[PDB]
């Protein structure tokens, strides 16, 4: 299958309440594996998956120094961005960075990413070519000129095509028991009377990994997208995810309705119905 690695970073300034808080996390696919929080006492990057724990002290030292450096760059960048947007020093602002790579079933690079946002909006992004930039506004154009002059994109390309892919391949092997296992949804349909005239049928998908899933209702083989309540996929807290889809049905018509479930972990897509 195809896989991804991402590092997410957020600094939030808090004028009059010390230096910004900095939090970064790393994921492979939908699995958190490392974390760093600047407000921890003597902060270190820490493992959050079993398969990364085997990395040696030199790995944790380098990671932690990278994280502390990123917090420091962010502090300077938050100051700079106040100037670029003609903002007062009184308010809290946010700086976000994501980077990483996608690989295919063969382990080859599919796409690399590096993008920044200020106050929840795009600032500057590396394009898919890993060679040119998209600046969101005239402020980010100042950054773009600075980063073009310094050949930043060339550095990112080298990381994203090389280490990002190589280390992701390493993690997928070391974590093969979990990262390369899809857990199918456990599914069932429940029935929730509204009145003597209608009831809700709710189709449940529980315990699945990764998070990607499709849940639909049909009535006599026709989709019911407009009349379906579909909740956002949500974490269970044990690596897995949950989702449900619900439709309101006239009393006595329940056997017309089928729920359809597609997920990577299932031997075959499911068709389920309410079973009194």
């Amino acid at each position: 299958g195809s896989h991804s690695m991402r590092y997410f970073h957020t600094s939030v300034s808090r004028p009059g309440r010390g230096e910004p808080r900095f939090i970064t996390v790393g994921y492979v696919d939908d699995t958190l594996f490392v974390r760093f929080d600047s407000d921890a006492a003597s902060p270190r990057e820490e493992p959050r998956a079993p398969w990364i724990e085997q990395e040696g002290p030199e790995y944790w030292d380098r990671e932690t120094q990278i994280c502390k450096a990123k917090a420091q760059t962010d502090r300077e960048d938050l100051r700079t961005l106040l100037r670029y947007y003609n903002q007062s020093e009184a308010g809290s602002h946010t700086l976000q960075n994501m980077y990483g790579c996608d690989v295919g079933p063969d382990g080859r690079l599919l796409r690399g990413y590096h993008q920044d946002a200020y106050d929840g909006k795009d600032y500057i992004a590396l394009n898919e070519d890993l060679s040119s930039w998209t600046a969101a506004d005239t402020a980010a154009q100042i950054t773009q000129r600075k980063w073009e002059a310094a050949r930043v994109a060339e550095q990112l390309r080298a990381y994203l095509e090389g280490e990002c892919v190589e280390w992701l391949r390493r993690y997928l092997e070391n974590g093969k028991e979990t990262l390369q296992r899809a857990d199918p949804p456990k599914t069932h349909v429940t029935h929730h009377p509204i009145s003597d005239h209608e009831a809700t049928l709710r189709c449940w998908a529980l315990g699945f990994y990764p998070a990607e899933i499709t849940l639909t209702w049909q009535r006599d083989g026709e989709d019911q997208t407009q009349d379906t309540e579909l909740v956002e996929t949500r974490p269970a807290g044990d690596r897995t995810f949950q989702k449900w889809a619900a439709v309101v049905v006239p009393s006595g018509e329940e056997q017309r309705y089928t729920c359809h479930v597609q997920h990577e972990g299932l031997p075959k897509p499911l068709t389920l119905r309410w079973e009194p």
């Binding site: 590092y7 300077e76 700079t80 500057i124």
Partner: peptide
């Protein structure tokens, strides 16, 4: 593993 960010905005 991560990369170092080197350049400020």
């Amino acid at each position: 593993r991560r990369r170092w960010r080197r350049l400020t905005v």
